[PDB]
């Protein structure tokens, strides 16, 4: 249904304009095909985005919410273990720029309030290359406690749609 979707706007389309919509929709489902991946085999729950609001709610909920400047801001998911939060962020790329832009912003942003409300985090980005499927992970905690990643990803599906789209745009 995804790619049937998909491949129905991209019959449809006859703008570049538009078609960027639809480009950047299909690296939004190839990110989310990554995170329910990652998480099934990391045996975790998945979510799809949760507010930091949120997480610190979950995992101190005798927190003072109010006496504190909770940035909104969506991490992908998180990893609470009893002692430390560990923020996670999936990323699908070939190269490792947006990686470092999402951990920056994730420090700046999250970092402080977490220190302040007492907890412990470590941002943590997880990357898988598509065309190599090799993973590369950021965070020094959350690789004591997963060093295997056993992964079965196929990205074929988000190439070809997005090839389609370069193909029928190539002017
Ligand atoms: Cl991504």
């Given at each position: 249904?995804?790619?049937?979707?998909?491949?129905?706007?991209?019959?449809?389309?006859?703008?570049?304009?538009?078609?960027?919509?639809?480009?950047?929709?299909?690296?939004?489902?190839?990110?989310?095909?990554?995170?329910?991946?990652?998480?099934?085999?990391?045996?975790?729950?998945?979510?799809?985005?949760?507010?930091?609001?949120?997480?610190?709610?979950?995992?101190?909920?005798?927190?003072?919410?109010?006496?504190?400047?909770?940035?909104?801001?969506?991490?992908?998911?998180?990893?609470?273990?009893?002692?430390?939060?560990?923020?996670?962020?999936?990323?699908?790329?070939?190269?490792?720029?947006?990686?470092?832009?999402?951990?920056?912003?994730?420090?700046?942003?999250?970092?402080?309030?977490?220190?302040?409300?007492?907890?412990?985090?470590?941002?943590?980005?997880?990357?898988?290359?598509?065309?190599?499927?090799?993973?590369?992970?950021?965070?020094?905690?959350?690789?004591?406690?997963?060093?295997?990643?056993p992964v079965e990803l196929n990205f074929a599906r988000?190439?070809?749609?997005?090839?389609?789209?370069?193909?029928?745009?190539?002017?």
């Amino acid at each position: 249904p995804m790619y049937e979707q998909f491949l129905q706007r991209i019959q449809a389309v006859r703008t570049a304009t538009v078609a960027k919509d639809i480009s950047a929709d299909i690296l939004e489902a190839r990110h989310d095909y990554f995170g329910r991946e990652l998480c099934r085999a990391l045996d975790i729950e998945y979510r799809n985005n949760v507010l930091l609001d949120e997480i610190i709610l979950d995992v101190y909920p005798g927190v003072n919410l109010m006496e504190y400047n909770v940035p909104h801001v969506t991490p992908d998911n998180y990893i609470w273990t009893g002692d430390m939060l560990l923020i996670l962020d999936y990323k699908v790329s070939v190269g490792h720029d947006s990686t470092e832009v999402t951990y920056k912003k994730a420090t700046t942003l999250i970092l402080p309030v977490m220190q302040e409300i007492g907890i412990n985090t470590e941002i943590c980005i997880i990357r898988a290359n598509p065309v190599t499927n090799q993973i590369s992970i950021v965070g020094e905690q959350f690789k004591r406690l997963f060093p295997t990643i056993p992964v079965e990803l196929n990205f074929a599906r988000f190439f070809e749609l997005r090839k389609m789209l370069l193909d029928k745009f190539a002017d």
